């Protein structure tokens, strides 16, 4: 055919080991992403999964051909034959391409020398969550990438006009959070091996507390009420009051641990931790209220509901 001869010519005397314009000028690469889906955010392990169609294009004067054909649209077969930039993701804990049924790669070459090269990737990027106020925390999870070996004098990156074509967010596995928006940057990070141009995409994710309310707060709120009904119970019923008190405080301990279990092992008190601890004070004080009562009931009936609802007023507005 007339297309097989073109491909033979392009790879004839083609050095796959040398970048375009080596020793002449830096190679400008225009990147572009279609975020297929932002997968589950793993707050415990401080990571998230993102599936993208990472497309990057550049000029390669070696791969220029003149004919009636405007573009050579090819499969993954030709990817290993030509020079491809060594883009890697700086904060990827683990990533993999897709290979079923065949390698999910695409390659297109125009007459002038343009190369479009896109591939499907599942990136388990690293997002350093700061859960000081949880589960109301909001995060800006990045995704950095750059050439692993080529410094700023050899590979320059740049966002195309269509920065990031975020897909339909309805089908995303993002349950905890909501995709607020995206933001891109471009800056030169200095390292021991040279100066490298880095391009990072920031995804802004806002937590939803609906699950944690039914999961954590509502059980925590309801158990605290069980302490209050101790007051309406007669003081003379010593086993009844202690039964309610010890049962109420002890199950509060289990709720704190299982609620604390959802969080990772971070050495600082979080907002969820603050709520359970205050609820711990009420249940403990309610038990201690009867301890002094046997050794006042009406005041507890008023102060305890007021303090908790007032405490919630201060907490939720914050």
């Amino acid at each position: 055919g007339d297309v097989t001869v073109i491909l033979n010519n392009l790879l004839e005397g083609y050095d796959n080991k040398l970048r375009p314009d080596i020793g002449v000028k830096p190679t400008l690469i225009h990147t572009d992403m279609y975020v297929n889906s932002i997968g589950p955010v793993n707050a415990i392990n401080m990571e998230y999964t993102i599936d993208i169609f990472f497309a990057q294009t550049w000029y390669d004067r070696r791969l220029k051909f003149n004919s009636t054909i405007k573009v050579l649209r090819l499969n993954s077969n030709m990817v290993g034959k030509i020079w491809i930039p060594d883009t890697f993701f700086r904060n990827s804990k683990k990533a993999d391409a897709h290979w079923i049924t065949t390698p999910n790669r695409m390659l297109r070459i125009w007459n002038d020398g343009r190369v479009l090269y896109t591939l499907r990737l599942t990136i388990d990027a690293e997002c350093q969550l700061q859960l000081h106020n949880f589960p109301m925390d909001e995060h800006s999870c990045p995704l950095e990438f750059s050439s692993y070996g080529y410094p700023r004098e050899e590979i320059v990156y740049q966002w195309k006009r269509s920065s990031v074509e975020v897909g339909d967010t309805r089908s995303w596995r993002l349950y905890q959070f909501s995709f607020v928006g995206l933001r891109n940057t471009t800056e030169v990070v200095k390292t021991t091996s040279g100066d490298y141009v880095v391009m990072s995409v920031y995804f802004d994710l806002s937590r939803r507390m609906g699950y944690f309310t039914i999961q954590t707060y509502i059980p925590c709120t309801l158990i605290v009420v069980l302490s209050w009904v101790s007051f309406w119970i007669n003081k003379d019923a010593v086993p009844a009051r202690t039964s309610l008190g010890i049962t109420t405080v002890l199950t509060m301990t289990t709720l704190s641990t299982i609620a604390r279990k959802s969080l990772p092992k971070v050495s600082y008190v979080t907002a969820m931790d603050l709520f359970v601890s205050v609820c711990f004070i009420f249940v403990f004080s309610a038990l201690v209220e009867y301890g002094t009562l046997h050794y006042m009931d009406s005041y507890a009936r008023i102060f305890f509901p007021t303090a908790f609802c007032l405490f919630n007023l201060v907490y939720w507005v914050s």
Binding site: D15, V24, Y148
Partner: protein, 99 residues
């Protein structure tokens, strides 16, 4: 385009008649391999498994008179796939369980 052609002859010259099986200065003084690390992260210290996971930019430099060129005045950074055609140290981490 002279550099593109000139650089191609240089890199082609080096890898021609290059024996990956023999280290630099084989049958001679030891080759001094300098090492340099940049820890990217320490993911998790696990007491249950008695191990920690560390991500690093493990870098090591050494001299190889076979790969010495002087025609072009610049440092050639090549495709990572060239590493399969060059002798590199057989460095291993005696502690690593899964890397």
């Amino acid at each position: 385009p002279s550099n593109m052609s000139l650089v191609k002859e240089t890199v082609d010259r080096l890898l021609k008649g290059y024996d990956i099986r023999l280290r630099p200065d084989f049958g001679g003084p030891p080759v001094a391999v300098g090492m340099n690390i940049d820890i990217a992260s320490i993911d998790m210290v696990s007491e249950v498994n008695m191990d920690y996971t560390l991500t690093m930019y493990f870098q090591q430099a050494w001299r190889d008179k076979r790969l010495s060129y002087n025609v072009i005045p610049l440092n050639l950074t090549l495709d990572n796939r060239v590493a399969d055609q060059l002798w590199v140290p057989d460095t291993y981490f005696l502690n690593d369980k899964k890397s």
